[PDB]
Write a protein that binds this ligand. Structure first.
Ligand code: AGS
Ligand code: ADP
Ligand code: ADP
Ligand code: MG
Ligand code: MG
Ligand code: MG
Ligand code: ZN
Lengths: 310, 483, 394, 104, 482, 104
DNA sequence: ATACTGTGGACCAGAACCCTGATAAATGCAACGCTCATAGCGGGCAGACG
């Protein structure tokens, strides 16, 4: 290819590859994969893409875009790197730069979505107007495609329509302006919007480049934080203050929208699994909700500072 | 074109008895010393130290080409290639009949008569097709270029009007093609023979089968000793065609031609032939002599190869502030810096002297080697740490990496060395002093004390007796100093 | 194929204040310096006059290829081409979000197969058109290879990634078949850029309707400046329904898509245009401009005359030779140079080292016989007699 | 048209210098699709990269084949050489050419 | 390998006038055929002084040239000969013009003169043999030498046929049927000169189609045998299951004649034989079970082990060696190797290489124990099960193989090659131990030769220990001028 | 083609003077193929070997060689010699050859 | 101050998966086939004289 579009500010690479075929009258879905990569077996993925580097060689004559900038600033990889572990973070890039695809989701053992859960194509009613007025084009954005919360962090709730990534595995689709974007009455859960606003700044923050606290470090930090202001009895978990904080700040309908039911009656609950010694990777939702419940006046980056320092 | 008339030596081995092709080769009775005589090195004296810094820069820039120290694997490769070369002519005996006549005669004798049993096993090719897989930057090509050039290429016979080509070299290039090797064999035969075989056989109209068919004829006509295909790593799989059909094509090459053939490659190219290598099948052949970097330790102690190479390479330094003994810390550090890869170990030492001649003090420090490492080993950062990891996949993925265009960078090093203003105090001392063979005493005893008194004392003694040998001069300059 | 990095100017006109495309070109030049810039000639030097005959013959024969002189009209043509190539980028600005609309609409025409489909009504296109009709042999192609050689062809930007192509030139197929113009547009952007658009757009059997939209969208994939079409007379020789099809497609492209187009052709191709744009008519030069001889003819004759390579020559020119030239050639720009070169070649070869009127007459009547019948009509001057044949003034 | 546009790549891959077409006689009248169309072919053979060409034909080819200014000026682009048989009497004097040729 | 055919008479009545049988080497009694196979290295008398590397190569060449017959080989040879020369009676190419004879018989049957007549005789099924034994007992080296006597491609000039006598197929590690089907074509067009793989083995056809085409291809050329080696990889792999694994080998009856041979490890018996209709086809012409030799026979030592070890013992190449073998070393071999023939020679080779490495230069029990405990680790469970003798325990571990042995051999060769040599002048440098010694050495090379230089340096320290280098120099030079 | 190339190699190795091919008429036209490709095979056979070749054929083979024999282009070769039966009347008189042969 | 009970961390084991090979069916695509327009041609009709 001779004219590969430069990615806009804060967009996914999937929409960039789509606009790389919208701009030159290529309508057969096979030819786009034939020209961009050269293989007819390459897949289409939203968040954590692979085969990167071939997408950077096209932009090579521009000295700015490289592999590291593409992966950190233009994917959904920032959400998984700091929390899981340092060595896995450092090896994910070398596993992802090359042609391997199956190992990417396996090694980062959190992407067991099974059936495509909310992988329907999503957009926002108000953001598209701003993108139109300031650019003249519409595209997919990383703010919309948060893995769990189906809410735009600034405002409102995303507009689901009926299609899926598994409907066509070998097709890159760009957003169509002539495809009608119809508004619906906004049904918003304010707690979910607040959580989205709280978790948004981590996506574009330089300090998340290398800071990943260790497993034992996580355990000591959580024990010390629980004992700082009295969330732990003498060698026993209180089980009451932890529940009443999260029920004060979060209601039950928010938790069922997040599919994160608490189980005080049942012994196996994720809240108790967090406070016990960690052995597997944990999602950002649990850490975020614990941070919000335990102390409400601290930012995500400085929370990671305090977690990692001690 | 060393067209020497065949002088027929006699070899006591019964298998090589009275073969016109074999006897013309050099004898092998003291070849062990000949194999160990491959060692070559520059000659350096203390005189070259006082020259200007550009002359020293040229001398240092001349070190990579004319330095070679034999190691353990070179002896094994020499003996194996000698066995392959000399055992390849037992079949094509010119004086007696060929192979097919022998098999037919054996069948006719075992039919009736009293020759009870005859074995039809015959020769698989004529020697095993060695496959010398190793990591890039280890030194295969120079090893073959020296140990295969001690045999005269052409032995022009007298009674038989045939040419006994002893060895040959095909070489692929970047983004090669399958037919390119077949064309290049014909093209390279012309340089060895002086003929124009490309005009009649090198037409592009021919298919892949016809090229091999004609290669069989020409390889049978001229008594051929070896066929060394080199740099399989440079080939591109997708351009030529099916990757798995390359193994079929190479097997067809090995079967049809019949002369011993030896391929070269990197662990990236291993996956092409791995199907035959894993099986212990006889007939697949393709024995592999693995090339590995120098190991630091042996039985919990430093390996003698590493220190033996290190001291010999360290004797070539001409630094002005140089100490006689190598320090142990740098010995510890550059191995982990370079992982023992043969090419880059010499390159770091080459670049260190050039960098130290310009940065300031003329010595060797661990920080200097580190700085050179971040300077000129950028393309080879991934492969070095892959070797450090030890996982075979990491090493396999990062093979074939080489530093581009070091020679052009050497020229700009020299140009930067040329343009400098300030001078060292030792430079002043050598310039002001009459350094015409009187310099040697000053240099050998400079580090004992300050040379402020030394500069006029040697002059006083030398003017006292102008006619002295340095041998008698040393006691006198030593005696006047202590006073 | 001259890849050049772009460094911007600072234009004065407020309409061009933002674009990188129009601020990447070399500046337009005043008519005073433009006339001097175009002119080129031969090195000559007197050292060759006493050299051998063979070494002199090739130097004589190299006259027609390296000798150009600007006439009166070329200074107008350069200005008009500059204006018409600068006026086609104000509606495709990538900074203020205009190329994205002009390129997004082109996908819809590809999908449905109609060229009148529009998605954004705000997208406005500005373009111009011209035709350059002139008698054959008047040197109109070389004018469009020397005026349009100041602008470099391919300029590469770095803030964007667009590889702008400033000008492109195609030749219509001899049969005029409606598929080969589209198949030859992908064979000039195929060589001037070093790509393989032909394989991905031509070998896949598409209809003409989709192949026409693929052109109009690929041309806007880059920033095409000028699509000048030479040899337009072959359009009349196509099958039925094609004579008007690409006299409507080439006005659809100018009006809707927004790529400027200029057409160049012979006088006998004017009929299809008039079978139903600014018009510039080119005519062979004549000395009798109003009541006195024209200055251009005299100046050009002297400029060509000072390139002789004969050892014994007349330095000053005579008017009889000028009259012989004007009565044997009729002023068409091709005959004069070839006639002079042949005359001095014969003079060098014979041994008589000086050019005379008789030698000119003999060479003209002995070596240019396939050309005489048409020049008889031009010499006669009768309108009815000159009206016959083709490629003559009408 | 594809063949004509494809000849240029091969004519530039190898630096072709000269291309001589002889026996142009046969193309005067045939199933070529049209005299003007074949003339358009011979004039659209300009797009081949350089490669000056020489055309050879009988005097029957000239009158039928060059009857238009745009194609006539390209045929005699470097002079049209015309040949004739030997003449016995030059100006009442025997030609030395004929005598020498016959004697040899 | 296009051997022309010259015929010979055969005493057997049934093989009367059939070229395929009569174009082969003639019959021999078992003992001669089982005694003509032995081979050994030359072992020239005076090749006990040479460089280390050449002798190392000669020792490394030992496993490839040492073969010694035993009891079972004669029976195996008899079975192979019967199978190869018993499947050619159905196909006799030399037939008289049978149209007249058949039509005359039909006429005499129809007219009532005769009463019965056999018109056309058709073949039925095929012979088959299976040879199973614990891995490492020699089921392929003892098959590449029994079949070496028979020529592979016999050419008939009077007719136009080629007699491909024997063909060797080896299943791969995957164990899929299509790999076997394509490997048949690979082996066949490797034996002759042809391109059968592209002509028939395309992707278009399914398994049944290639299986049916093998019959036509094996009738176009006269096959005599078809051996399948390493059948243990078809036990439980991705071959469609054990049911289809059984069904494929049962359906291999449709190949015309061509008595097949199956070789596998003792584990394959349980998977491969579980139905009556398949076992009788497996052991259709016997079922021979190999087993490693034992030290004793019945309260008394076995002679075959004695002969094998004693004959192997002379072939060693060492400076000082005890030609008369001591019984303790033989008992050590029987204790370590336990009987499996693969390990017996490998232990000797590795022990010899390590003996050259250490410079002990003698073969003893301690060296054998050290090398056995160092190198041959993974094979331990099989040997420890062999010691017990319980059938289930021995059957559990009869598939183990030692890896990377060639790489270890090559690295050992590099180790013994890297010994190098120390000249006395070079050794003088190693004599200097203190760093000050080497420093004074390095400064004082140019003026004096080392031979005189080193002694006066050494006495300089032996006389006065604690005294510095610049102060050392005058006394050294005082010694030197004198 | 491999047979042709190896044939050329052998013919270059040994000093080969003449190569006579006899009875072209007996070649079957069914399994061979087109007369055009048979002509192409013979033309390639003439050039590749490099030694003079002599062909013998029936007048029906002239039908096969119609294309290459009509052309007068140099380098095509294939000079034709026509065997004819003994004619009687030449110059209006009975031939001497027939009379002498008949008497003998 | 030791038996009783919670409890956190370490630990068995069935299960959804999911990857892969063997086989049938839909299908895109160079491979001829067809159509269209165009230029010369030999049996048939008007003609015409002794
Ligand atoms: N103004 C001029 N000054 C100098 N030489 C000129 C001029 N105009 C034409 N020529 C010469 O005339 C020739 C130009 O003729 P062409 O390049 O063939 O253009 P053209 O043939 O007139 O275009 P056509 O007939 O429409 S295809 C070259 O030899 C030029 O050197
Ligand atoms: N004994 C040695 N002394 C110095 N340099 C060596 C020695 N052996 C190998 N080399 C280095 O190896 C390099 C060539 O080998 P290499 O490039 O690895 O072969 P290939 O081109 O096949 O990869 C040379 O630049 C040379 O400096
Ligand atoms: N009769 C024999 N005498 C000596 N060594 C033998 C004999 N038979 C086999 N071997 C040894 O066995 C090795 C090959 O074993 P192999 O037959 O491949 O085992 P398996 O049959 O289990 O595959 C050879 O290296 C050879 O030295
Ligand atoms: Mg190399
Ligand atoms: Mg032109
Ligand atoms: Mg085996
Ligand atoms: Zn929004």
């Amino acid at each position: 290819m001779r004219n590969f579009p430069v990615p806009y500010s804060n967009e996914l690479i999937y929409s960039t590859i789509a606009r790389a075929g919208v701009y030159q009258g290529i309508v057969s879905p096979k030819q786009l994969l034939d020209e961009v990569y050269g293989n007819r077996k390459v897949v289409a993925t939203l968040g954590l893409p692979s085969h990167l580097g071939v997408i950077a060689r096209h932009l090579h004559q521009t000295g700015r875009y490289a592999v590291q900038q593409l992966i950190y600033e233009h994917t959904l990889f920032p959400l998984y790197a700091p929390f899981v572990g340092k060595e896995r973070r450092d090896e994910a890039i070398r596993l992802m730069e090359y042609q391997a695809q199956g190992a990417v989701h396996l090694m980062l053992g959190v992407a067991a979505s099974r059936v495509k859960s909310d992988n329907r194509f999503r957009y926002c009613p108000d953001c598209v107007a701003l993108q139109l007025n300031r650019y003249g084009e519409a595209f997919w954005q990383r703010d919309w495609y948060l893995p769990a919360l189906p809410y735009c962090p600034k405002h409102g709730a995303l507009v689901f329509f009926d299609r899926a990534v598994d409907d066509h595995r070998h097709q890159f689709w760009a957003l169509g302006h002539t495809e009608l974007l119809s508004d619906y009455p906004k049904d918003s859960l304010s707690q979910l919007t607040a959580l989205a606003a709280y978790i948004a700044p981590l996506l574009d923050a330089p300090r998340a480049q290398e800071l990943s606290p260790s497993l034992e470090q996580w355990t000591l930090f959580y024990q010390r934080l629980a004992q700082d202001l009295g969330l732990t009895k003498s060698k026993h978990i209180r089980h009451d203050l932890v529940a009443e904080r999260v029920r004060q700040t979060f209601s039950d309908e928010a938790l069922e929208k997040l599919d994160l039911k608490l189980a005080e009656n049942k012994d196996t609950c994720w809240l108790k699994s967090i406070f016990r010694k960690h052995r597997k990777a944990f999602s950002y939702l649990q850490h975020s909700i614990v941070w919000q419940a335990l102390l409400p006046k601290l930012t995500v980056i400085e929370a990671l500072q305090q977690a990692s320092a001690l | 074109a060393t067209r020497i008339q065949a002088v027929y030596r006699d070899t006591g081995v019964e298998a090589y008895r009275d073969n016109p092709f074999i006897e013309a080769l050099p004898p092998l009775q003291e070849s062990v010393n000949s194999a160990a005589s491959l060692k070559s090195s520059l000659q350096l004296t203390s005189s070259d130290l006082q020259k200007s810094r550009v002359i020293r820069a040229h001398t240092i820039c001349r070190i990579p080409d004319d330095y070679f120290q034999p190691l353990g694997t070179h002896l094994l490769l020499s003996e194996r290639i000698s066995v392959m070369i000399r055992g390849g002519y037992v079949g094509r005996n010119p004086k007696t009949g060929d192979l097919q006549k022998h098999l037919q005669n054996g069948y006719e004798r075992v039919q009736t008569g009293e020759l009870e049993t005859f074995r039809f096993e015959e020769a698989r090719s004529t020697a095993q097709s060695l496959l010398l897989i190793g990591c890039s930057g280890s030194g295969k090509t120079t090893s073959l270029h020296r140990i295969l050039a001690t045999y005269p290429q052409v032995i022009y016979h007298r009674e038989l009007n045939v040419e006994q080509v002893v060895y040959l070299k095909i070489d692929c290039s970047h983004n090669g093609s399958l037919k390119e090797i077949c064309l290049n064999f014909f093209r390279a035969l012309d340089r060895a023979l002086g003929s124009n075989y490309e005009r009649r056989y090198g037409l592009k109209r021919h298919g892949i089968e016809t090229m091999l068919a004609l290669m069989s004829q020409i390889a049978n006509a001229h008594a051929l000793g070896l066929l060394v295909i080199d740099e399989i790593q440079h080939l591109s799989r997708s351009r030529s065609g099916g990757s798995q059909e390359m193994l079929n094509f190479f097997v067809t090459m090995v079967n049809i031609i019949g002369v011993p053939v030896m391929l070269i490659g990197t662990p990236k190219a291993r996956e092409i032939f791995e199907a035959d290598l894993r099986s212990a099948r006889r007939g697949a052949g393709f024995g592999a002599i693995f090339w590995d970097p120098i190991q630091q330790t042996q039985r919990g102690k430093p390996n003698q190869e590493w220190i033996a190479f290190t001291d010999n390479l360290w004797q070539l330094q001409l630094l002005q502030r140089k100490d006689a003994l190598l320090s142990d810390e740098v010995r510890d550090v550059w191995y982990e810096l370079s992982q023992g890869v043969m090419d880059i170990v010499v390159k770091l030492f080459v670049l260190a002297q050039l960098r130290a001649l310009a940065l300031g003090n003329e010595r060797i420090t661990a920080g200097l080697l580190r700085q050179v490492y971040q300077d000129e080993l950028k393309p080879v950062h991934p492969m070095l740490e892959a070797l450090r990891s030890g996982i075979p996949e990491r090493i396999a993925r990062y093979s074939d990496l080489v530093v581009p265009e070091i020679d052009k960078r050497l020229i700009q090093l020299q140009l930067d060395i040329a343009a400098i203003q300030e001078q060292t105090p030792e430079e002043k001392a050598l310039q002001e002093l009459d350094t015409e063979d009187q310099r040697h005493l000053y240099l050998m005893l400079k580090e004992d004390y300050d040379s402020s008194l030394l500069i006029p004392t040697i002059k006083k003694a030398f003017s006292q007796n102008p006619t002295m040998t340095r041998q008698k001069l040393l006691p006198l300059v030593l005696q006047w100093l202590m006073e």
